[PDB]
Amino acid sequence: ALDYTIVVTASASQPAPLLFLAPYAGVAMGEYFMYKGKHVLVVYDDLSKQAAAYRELSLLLRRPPGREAYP
């Protein structure tokens, strides 16, 4: 399956800035082929961890919380 797939990894030891920008980097790599005529499947494994990373990212930038302290 690696003849046609691209793995984008943002592990837990990496800072939450890199977990925040992982789906947007993945969908940018996808839309490069989408605006050329190709067909792309983008799998976002655990976007809830992106939500936790962006919650961390907003609480450390001192933005006001909401419910469950998500911004």
């Binding site: 001192r62 006001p64 919380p65 302290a69």
Partner: protein
């Protein structure tokens, strides 16, 4: 046969009485857990609101 039918109706009566007793015990334990979850929900939402007010 009549004695067995009488014992049938009495056994179904005792079984449904025990079913009501088990259902009521489940009601009271679930209301204890309901009150615990109710207190936890209100203290969670008040901590969220006052943290958001302290954020400003």
């Amino acid at each position: 046969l009549l004695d067995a039918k009488a014992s049938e109706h009495a056994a179904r009566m005792t079984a449904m009485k025990n079913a009501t007793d088990n259902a009521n015990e489940l009601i009271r334990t679930l209301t204890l857990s309901y009150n615990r979850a109710r207190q936890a929900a209100i203290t969670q939402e008040i901590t969220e609101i006052v943290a958001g007010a302290n954020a400003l």
